[PDB]
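Handout for the seminar on molecular recognition.
Each group receives one record of this type.
Step one: identify the two inputs.
Step two: read the structure output and locate the region that could contact 2-methylidenebutanedioic acid.
Step three: write two sentences on what you found, then compare them with the reference statements printed after the record.
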Amino acid sequence: GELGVLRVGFTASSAFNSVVPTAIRAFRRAYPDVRLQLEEDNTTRLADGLNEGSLDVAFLRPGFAGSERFHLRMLSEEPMMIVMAENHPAASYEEISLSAFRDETFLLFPREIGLTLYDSVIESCRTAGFEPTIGQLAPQIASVINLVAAEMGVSIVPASMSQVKVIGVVYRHIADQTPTAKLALAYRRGDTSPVLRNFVLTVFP
Amino acid sequence: GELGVLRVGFTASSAFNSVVPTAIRAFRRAYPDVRLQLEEDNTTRLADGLNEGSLDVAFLRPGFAGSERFHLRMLSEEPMMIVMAENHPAASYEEISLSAFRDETFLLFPREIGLTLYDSVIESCRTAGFEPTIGQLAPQIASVINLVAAEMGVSIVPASMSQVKVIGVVYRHIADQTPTAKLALAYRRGDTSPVLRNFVLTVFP
Ligand SMILES: C=C(CC(=O)O)C(=O)O
Ligand SMILES: C=C(CC(=O)O)C(=O)O
């Protein structure tokens, strides 16, 4: 499996986690004659792509319905952080608890694209003792961060999204809970393709 | 047109330009009873969405084939910048000329999603006197930046993408040419909807 093409998907936020570019670069160097066709889409779409054979492997968020039909190998777990406007009152706090936002508007992406990550944001607020008020939905976490800059609310994001230094936003660690965003390598059961095997073994030497 | 829904599209990179969140927030405050349905997609898809009626207005890049069928109002022009790995030899230069990359690999997004921006990157290199070697394609400019962090090549991006401070990349202004990335508000000709009118007049008071 030194020649051919591999269709590799990942979520938009997952690309900001170092494991994704690290794996892509490592595979390209070890197997230069395998063309990587890269697709950026959310976990719901990536799982469907794996199921229908339009993707060969994906960096996605584990836990979705039917995930037991695929192989899932954990690649990164990272804390979740609050993103807020620089002038938000909580930005002056020495320690940030989620209860400070019990009456704040949360911006999010539409649940249907990534149920597990969306639900983990809601449950984080529930663990802090409140039902969050969800305001404007935006398509991706980067889109949400840009609306946070316009003071439309706050959000909770994978820690690696703190690289997205939109002017006028700040990222803070959460004093509660330690909610975590998870990234796994996903691929079909009983797909014995040697190219896929070479990719999986590159990601997990 | 104080009630209803407006379907608003924008490209993933365009959200990092302040005009997009500024306009969305201003409209939401002036017309709270109009629901904004936000879609993030590239200029090719946004133009098709406007044509088929699945979008009402878009922040897109002007110049595409058939653009004369729509209204296009310029909203922002910004310089384009080089994004490269922090350890690239040109990162030490006092002034950055595109000819320094004449033998470097350029990473880009697939041309079909945004012909005008893609072609402006190629022509920038041509104006500098070389045909660029295009390496790995990634789906969006943010995806490309993350691969630049893995030292897979360099790219040219709208200046506002310099907010995307992926660890291990740097952004530099270009000594040549002044290549510019353009953002326009696009909507259908002869669409007399009062909600759309209210949005357009919010963006251009
Ligand atoms: C918005 C999401 C959630 C998902 O696709 O699982 C992401 O960027 O990872
Ligand atoms: C990749 C592009 C080009 C386009 O969609 O016109 C962008 O993010 O703006």
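Reference statements: Chain A touches chain B through 32 residues (CB under 8 Å). The helical segments of chain A are 19-30, 43-52, 115-127, 141-149, 194-203.
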